Design goal:
Protease (chains A, B); homodimer; seven-stranded mixed sheet; binds sodium ion; binds chloride ion; 4% helix; 1 helix; binds the ligand COc1ccc(S(=O)(=O)N(CC(C)C)C[C@@H](O)[C@H](Cc2ccccc2)NC(=O)O[C@H]2CO[C@H]3O[C@@H]4OCC[C@@H]4[C@H]32)cc1; hydrolase/hydrolase inhibitor; Cathepsin D, subunit A, domain 1; aspartic acid protease
Chain lengths: 99, 99
């Protein structure tokens, strides 16, 4: 689709068998989801933002369905105030900014 | 232009006669710039992200060029880690997300 930016670009995602709402976020290098369980191995990471850093768990090779499009990549899980789809998975669904 | 997201979507902006680099950020409601002097009065605002909240100075009706497109609108000034162009000015330059 083409999504205008009058409102937050929120979409439905499926991750870990769960449906969630998430922000399509071109200012995010990585995908960061609120606390949930994911299978397999993980390692700790710190990620920064406007107001400092949070500690997250980094899971690699996770499949997510984003507004109907499947993609695979790293997902960070931790106390983010919003679920964010960052550039590592936006590229995979072929998202671009146009003006 | 059509901007892919394999790299950060950094563009050149011009504000107060100076050039700066900024991120086109669909996950940001608000444009937030690092400390600089702007004319006129400002109003307080608290914004929040990953890590938590920060206090910023809100300047309204500021002239700013973004990737060669003129915008005139609200700019928040504060301790953001990077200059961010949010939806309030992305809409003024005609930006959409597409996939
Ligand atoms: C390494 O991978 C990462 C690293 C950092 C981040 S981030 O969330 O800190 N952020 C990076 C950016 C500051 C360079 C992505 C942004 O899109 C966040 C994404 C974000 C959204 C909401 C809450 C937390 C984060 N937006 C944001 O901070 O917006 C601020 C400014 O305007 C307001 O609009 C937003 O909505 C109201 C609050 C925020 C305020 C994500 C993945
Ligand atoms: Cl990845
Ligand atoms: Cl591509
Ligand atoms: Na894994």
């Amino acid at each position: 689709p083409q999504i205008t930016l009058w409102k937050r670009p929120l979409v439905t995602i499926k991750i870990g068998g769960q449906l969630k709402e998430a922000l399509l976020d071109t200012g995010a290098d990585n995908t960061v989801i609120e606390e949930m369980s994911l299978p397999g191995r993980w390692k700790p990471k710190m990620i920064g933002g406007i107001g400092g850093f949070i500690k997250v768990r980094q899971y690699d090779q996770i499949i997510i369905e984003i507004a109907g499009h499947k993609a695979i990549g790293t997902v960070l899980v931790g106390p983010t105030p919003v679920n964010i789809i960052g550039r590592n998975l936006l590229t995979q669904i072929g998202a671009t900014l146009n003006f």
